[PDB]
Motif scaffolding. Structure first.
Motif, PDB file in Angstrom:
ATOM      1  N   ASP A  69       0.806  -1.151  -0.110  1.00 21.32           N
ATOM      2  CA  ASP A  69      -0.013  -0.021  -0.150  1.00 21.32           C
ATOM      3  C   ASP A  69       0.787   1.210  -0.017  1.00 21.32           C
ATOM      4  O   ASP A  69       0.623   2.150   0.861  1.00 21.32           O
ATOM      5  CB  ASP A  69      -1.138   0.053   0.951  1.00 21.32           C
ATOM      6  CG  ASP A  69      -1.978  -1.128   1.168  1.00 21.32           C
ATOM      7  OD1 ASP A  69      -2.533  -1.179  -0.136  1.00 21.32           O
ATOM      8  OD2 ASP A  69      -2.407  -1.694   1.934  1.00 21.32           O
ATOM      9  N   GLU A  91       0.896   3.559  -2.360  1.00 20.23           N
ATOM     10  CA  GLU A  91       0.313   5.010  -2.810  1.00 20.23           C
ATOM     11  C   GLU A  91      -0.624   5.206  -1.891  1.00 20.23           C
ATOM     12  O   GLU A  91      -1.010   6.673  -1.843  1.00 20.23           O
ATOM     13  CB  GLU A  91      -0.400   4.449  -4.372  1.00 20.23           C
ATOM     14  CG  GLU A  91       0.664   4.199  -5.456  1.00 20.23           C
ATOM     15  CD  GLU A  91       0.876   2.872  -5.662  1.00 20.23           C
ATOM     16  OE1 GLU A  91       1.941   2.334  -6.044  1.00 20.23           O
ATOM     17  OE2 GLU A  91       0.336   1.829  -4.732  1.00 20.23           O
ATOM     18  N   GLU A  92      -1.151   4.487  -1.237  1.00 21.24           N
ATOM     19  CA  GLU A  92      -2.053   4.744  -0.108  1.00 21.24           C
ATOM     20  C   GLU A  92      -1.557   5.510   1.190  1.00 21.24           C
ATOM     21  O   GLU A  92      -1.797   6.598   1.788  1.00 21.24           O
ATOM     22  CB  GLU A  92      -2.837   3.729   0.513  1.00 21.24           C
ATOM     23  CG  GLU A  92      -3.899   3.020  -0.609  1.00 21.24           C
ATOM     24  CD  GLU A  92      -5.151   3.609  -0.130  1.00 21.24           C
ATOM     25  OE1 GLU A  92      -6.089   3.460  -1.278  1.00 21.24           O
ATOM     26  OE2 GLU A  92      -5.476   4.503   0.638  1.00 21.24           O
ATOM     27  N   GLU A 138      -1.083   9.068  -0.153  1.00 19.53           N
ATOM     28  CA  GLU A 138      -2.145   9.776   0.103  1.00 19.53           C
ATOM     29  C   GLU A 138      -2.552  10.000   1.372  1.00 19.53           C
ATOM     30  O   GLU A 138      -3.015  11.475   1.633  1.00 19.53           O
ATOM     31  CB  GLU A 138      -3.372   8.897  -0.626  1.00 19.53           C
ATOM     32  CG  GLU A 138      -4.797   9.628  -0.774  1.00 19.53           C
ATOM     33  CD  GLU A 138      -4.735  10.709  -1.894  1.00 19.53           C
ATOM     34  OE1 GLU A 138      -3.852  10.799  -2.517  1.00 19.53           O
ATOM     35  OE2 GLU A 138      -5.959  11.221  -2.119  1.00 19.53           O
TER      36      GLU A 138
END
Ligand SMILES: *[C@@H]1O[C@H](CO)[C@@H](O)[C@H](O)[C@H]1NC(C)=O
Lengths: 52, 52
Positions: B10, B12-13, B16
């Motif tokens: 995860d 890219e999470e 973000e």
């Protein structure tokens, strides 16, 4: 763990509302001026007809 | 980045989540000397070099 989808959904929902608000305000402020000019033109045509 | 090869779960999470962060405070969650009495904490690798 789906924060990107939530931000995409918020982006779509907050992008459509701005466009529709802008369109509604432009429509009202143009049609009001067209109505007022149309009334002034009609009074001018009656004056010209009576004069003629 | 990841000097030792592997998969970052995860990533890219994590980007973000870290996008809307103003500050951080780096603190020692587990002390190296005292929280591992019965293991060897010294571990080095050639994939991550520092000053040759
Ligand atoms: C580590 O080894 C010592 C010596 O036997 C023992 O008393 C202790 O329970 C072990 N574990 C930890 C977490 O210190």
């Amino acid at each position: 763990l789906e924060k990107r989808m939530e931000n995409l959904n918020k982006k779509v929902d907050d992008g459509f509302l701005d466009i529709w608000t802008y369109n509604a305000e432009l429509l009202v402020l143009l049609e009001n001026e067209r109505t007022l000019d149309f009334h002034d033109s009609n009074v001018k045509n009656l004056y010209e007809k009576v004069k003629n | 980045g990841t000097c030792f090869p592997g998969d970052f779960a995860d990533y890219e999470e994590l980007r973000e989540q870290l996008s809307s962060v103003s500050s951080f405070e780096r603190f020692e969650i587990f002390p190296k000397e005292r929280s591992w009495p019965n293991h060897t904490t010294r571990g080095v690798t050639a994939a991550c070099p520092h000053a040759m």
